[PDB]
């Protein structure tokens, strides 16, 4: 049911170059949360693109649905801002009201909350209040205006490796959001694990305790039904420098991390591509350069996993990182 794609406004991909044929849902990232008013705002840079996002994409795929994403991975400061907004009923009200009005005023079908991350039992309770009040406002605004109701989603931590999932209210999510975008990636980055090559977003991780499978299982255990979970797919990976170009498998000795790299830039490298079916990851190497990332095989494998578990679907972060829609096409084809 969801073939999701995030369009990151700072990516350089123009809205008119998006191919919405491979998606059911497109997220326009990100509106900003104003710390002063606690209103959802759009930067003057984004206003023209956001205001025509939906009209533009629907010219190519009229059945595609759009949502305005709010927040971002903006560090602890942005988390603080969401946290303080969520703490008071009147702040939540400003955010709720402005988010709905902004979605309507800019022809979005929905809103996507990206608070990274609730990080206390109080954050948890406030998150539940925020989303119940948001659902209530969305149902009221829809009934009072006659306008078809906004969709509500949230992007959520995808593993205890990323953030303690105990600080999400699973039951409040199940009853109040239409689905969640489970961020099942960035588990084993080259910045955090610089001395051994890793699968950064492995489906399974039998040498440890965290994986996409662990995260999905925890979300289901936490009170969210599989039919409200969308599996996250990263369109980028991480790079390491190998100690020895001849020692180039998973968990190979590395001298350091060399950052994150878009899929489209990994494919550029050529070299040798491999697929590990135990962890479900691709990797690619040339000389001492090593990349751990999702290529078409692991994308297909993750999408098949999602479909077999009865998940709602999948989403990609983010679409500009793809190469000629290769991963987007692969994921859509895998789902059917």
Minimum CB distance to Na ion smaller for 78 or for 131: 131
d(CA 271, CA 284): 7
Stretch that binds Na ion, among 16-24, 199-207, 237-245, 265-273 (CB under 5 A): 237-245
Please tell me whether residue 105 binds Na ion under the rule CB under 5 A. Answer: yes
Site string for Na ion, 250-289 (x = CB under 5 A): -----xx---------------------------------
Minimum CB separation of residue 241 from Na ion in Å reads 5
Q: In angstroms, rounded to a whole number, what is the distance separating the alpha carbons of residues 140 and 249?
A: 55
The residue among 222, 215, 164, 228 whose CA lies nearest residue 185 is: 215
**Which residues, 6 or more positions from 130, have their beta carbon under 8 angstroms from its beta carbon?**
85, 86, 92, 95, 96, 113
CB-based contacts of 217, cutoff 8 Å, min separation 6: none
Q: Output phi, psi for 55, to 5 deg.
A: -55, -40
Least distance from Na ion to the Cβ atom of residue 53, Å = 13
Nearer to Na ion, 36 or 44 (CB): 44
Catalytic residue among 116, 141, 214, 320: 116
Q: In sequence order, what E strands does 93-193 have?
A: 110-114, 151-157, 179-183
The residue with tokens 């998006």 is: 18
Minimum gap (Å) between residue 230 Cβ and Na ion = 15
Map the footprint of Na ion across residues 8-47, applying CB under 5 A.
none
Least distance (Å) between residue 183 CB and Na ion: 21
CB of 105 to Na ion, least distance (A): 4
Binding mask 53-92 for Na ion (x = CB under 5 A): ----------------------------------------
147 and 162 Cβ atoms separated by less than 8 Å: no
Residue carrying the six token digits 């010219």: 59
Minimum CB distance to Na ion, residue 135 (Å): 7
Contacts of 246 (CB under 8 A, 6+ apart): none
Nearer to Na ion, 39 or 284 (CB): 39
Segment contacting Na ion by CB under 5 A, of 25-33, 100-108, 214-222, 322-330: 100-108
Give 302's DSSP letter. Answer: H
What does the per-residue mask of binding to Na ion show for 193-232, with x meaning CB under 5 A?
----------------------------------------
Name residues whose C-beta falls within 8 Å of residue 122's C-beta, 6 or more positions apart in sequence: 87
Residue 262 and residue 268 in contact, taking contact as beta carbons nearer than 8 Å: no
Active site residue 116: yes
**Closer residue to Na ion, CB minimum distance, 178 or 214:** 178
Q: 164 vs 253, which CB is nearer to Na ion?
A: 253
Residue nearest to Na ion (CB): 255
Looking at the DSSP bridge assignments, the partners of residue 7 are 28
Catalytic site residues?
116
Q: Which residues bind Na ion (CB under 5 A)?
A: 105, 241, 255-256
């Amino acid at each position: 049911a969801i073939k999701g794609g995030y369009w990151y406004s700072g990516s350089g991909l123009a809205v008119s170059d998006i191919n919405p044929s491979h998606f059911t849902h497109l997220f326009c990232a990100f509106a900003d949360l104003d710390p002063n008013t606690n209103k959802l705002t759009i930067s003057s840079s984004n206003a023209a693109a956001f205001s025509t996002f939906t009209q533009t994409v629907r010219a190519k795929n009229p059945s595609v649905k759009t949502l305005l994403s709010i927040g971002g991975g903006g560090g602890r400061a942005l988390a603080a801002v969401f946290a303080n907004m969520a703490s008071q009923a009147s702040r939540r009200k400003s955010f709720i009201d402005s988010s709905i009005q902004l979605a309507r005023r800019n022809n979005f079908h929905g809103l996507d909350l990206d608070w990274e991350y609730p990080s206390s039992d109080i954050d948890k309770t406030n998150f539940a209040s925020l989303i119940r009040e948001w659902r209530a406002a969305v149902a009221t605004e829809s009934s009072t205006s006659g306008t078809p109701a906004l969709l509500l989603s949230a992007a959520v931590g995808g593993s205890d490796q990323i953030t303690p999932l105990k600080y999400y209210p699973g039951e409040a999510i199940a009853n109040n959001l239409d689905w969640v975008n489970v961020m099942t990636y960035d588990l084993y980055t080259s910045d955090s694990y610089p001395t051994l090559t890793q699968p950064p977003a492995p489906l399974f991780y039998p040498r440890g305790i965290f994986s996409a499978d662990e995260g999905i299982t925890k979300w289901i255990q936490s009170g969210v039904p599989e039919s409200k979970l969308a599996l996250g797919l990263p369109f980028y990976g991480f790079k390491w420098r190998l100690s020895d170009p001849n020692n180039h498998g998973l968990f190979a000795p590395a001298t350091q991390g060399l950052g994150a790299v878009k899929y489209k830039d990994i494919v550029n490298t050529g070299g040798q591509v491999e697929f590990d079916s135990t962890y479900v990851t691709n990797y690619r190497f040339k000389g001492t350069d090593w990349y751990g990332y999702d290529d078409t095989q692991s994308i297909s494998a993750k999408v098949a996993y999602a479909k077999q578990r009865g998940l709602f679907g999948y989403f990609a972060w983010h679409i500009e990182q793809d190469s000629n829609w290769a991963l987007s096409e692969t994921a859509s084809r895998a789902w059917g």
